[PDB]
Amino acid sequence: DLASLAIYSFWIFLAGLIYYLQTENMREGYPLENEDGTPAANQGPFPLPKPKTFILPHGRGTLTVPGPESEDRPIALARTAVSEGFPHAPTGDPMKDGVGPASWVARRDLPELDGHGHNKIKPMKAAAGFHVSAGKNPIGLPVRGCDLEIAGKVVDIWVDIPEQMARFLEVELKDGSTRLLPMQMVKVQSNRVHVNALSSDLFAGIPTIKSPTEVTLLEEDKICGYVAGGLMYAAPKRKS
């Protein structure tokens, strides 16, 4: 019976497909590890796939995955129990240490490039001739933290050139230096910009960028990690 054969075959095909998909999704994070770094004994019934190689543009190299997995950074946590499966308590200040929801990944300390090889992300001032086209222009607005104190003022918007979207607000602090705040973690209002994730004292603690008109992937992760970490770790100083 043709329909019987078709259905049996499909179920067989579908099982191969799930295997192909499951294994393809094991090109990062695997092999599994114990809470201490070493390979866990039980990896599961799915083997790692044969490697593949992405050729990166702009002379940036290749990526080959799966490949040796390391964090390439200190992880300031410690065990809080004597067996697998409990939490790992921060050993210093988890905001400053970049652990927990403040985590960052050791990405390439260069900036993402557009398809022409130029920095994808620039402050608007250096991006010709980008301008706010709709909505309230935040530039000029004082920035308020979750303690309801002004931490600074918005002095530019960093924009993604090829996608034409705001990505950070550059904010100036009491001391005259600036910080990037992710666009996605501010509420632009009519008389201010509000930042629920950070109290006003934690702005200075935001990771700073090395050159004032570009940002690297590494710096982006440190900034975004830090600001989001604020939700958990600045929730003592917040507030009704």
Binding site: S4, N25, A134, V186
Partner: protein, 302 residues
């Protein structure tokens, strides 16, 4: 208090973006369209440019001919009366030839021939458009995933209008061009074949369809939730995993015990979706050609 990234709060505009060049013949791009601020609260503001070329014109022309051929028959059914046209807009229908004419191209205009004409224009417009999705990837040095995926849709459409009618020996087995009439065709097809709920390929199709809504709600929400770490910049998270990609993986690992990569999720996606029309077209193709009644077939658990 907290913001959600469903709509942008601030738009920014720069020079119209004309696109990457690679091996594309730039003679064939239009120039940019207007910018829509309205669009810009949700996605991009920029309309255009678009690429024409010979295939594009063929498709577009051919596709309009299909559409106007259907619309000429509708005005006719309305005795050229505008008020009646709007009124009965969803009740008109350009029906295929009656079974007597089988697969012959002999049926008069008013009794099938017009349907064949419109079907011809559609066949040309779609396949030209398929070739278009391949060719525009090729010009840019990209993989052919979009044309392979589109081919899955085409398979169902081909089975409904062309492959199944031929195997059943008659054009009268095909789907009519009309809003209500196509739904009636659909219902009638289930009834006549013993209820499609008993067709395992139909039930798979469904699983995939509902599965696609699962998966895109899931994926879509995930990227939005990690979009504060740049999650939507997926191609760079692939080349260089960041905390966005890791928190995404980990949400799912902690929720349901396994998880994807920033690349592989898109393979789950391309497949969940294409399997809808893929299993679906098999289901229809077998209907009446090989199985007359899915209830019955189903009783012989096989």
């Amino acid at each position: 208090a907290e913001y959600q990234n469903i709509f942008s709060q601030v738009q920014v505009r720069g020079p119209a973006d004309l696109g990457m060049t690679e091996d594309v013949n730039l003679a064939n791009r239009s120039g940019v369209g207007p910018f829509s601020t309205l669009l810009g609260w949700f996605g991009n503001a920029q309309l255009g440019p678009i690429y024409l070329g010979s295939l594009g014109v063929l498709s577009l022309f051919s596709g309009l001919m299909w559409f106007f051929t259907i619309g000429i028959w509708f005005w006719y059914q309305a005795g050229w009366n505008p008020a009646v046209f709007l009124r009965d807009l969803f009740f008109f229908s350009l029906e295929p030839p009656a079974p007597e004419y089988g697969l012959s191209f002999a049926a008069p205009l008013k009794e099938g021939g017009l349907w064949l004409i419109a079907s011809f224009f559609m066949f040309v417009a779609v396949w030209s458009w398929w070739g278009r999705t391949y060719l525009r990837a090729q010009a840019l040095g990209m993989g052919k995933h979009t044309a392979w995926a589109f081919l899955s849709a085409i398979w169902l459409w081909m089975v409904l209008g062309f492959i199944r009618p031929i195997l059943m020996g008659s054009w009268s087995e095909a789907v009519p061009y009309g809003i209500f009439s196509h739904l009636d065709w659909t219902n009638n097809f289930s009834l006549v074949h013993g209820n499609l709920f008993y067709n395992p390929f139909h039930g798979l199709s469904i699983a995939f369809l509902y599965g696609s809504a699962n998966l895109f709600a899931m994926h879509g929400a995930t990227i939005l939730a990690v979009s504060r770490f740049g999650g939507e910049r997926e191609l760079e998270q692939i080349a260089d995993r960041g905390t966005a990609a890791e928190r995404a993986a980990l949400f799912w690992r902690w929720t349901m015990g396994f998880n994807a990569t920033m690349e592989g999720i898109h393979r789950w996606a391309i497949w969940m979706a294409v399997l809808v029309t893929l299993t679906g077209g098999i289901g229809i193709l077998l209907s009446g050609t090989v199985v007359d009644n899915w209830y019955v077939w189903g009783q012989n658990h096989g």
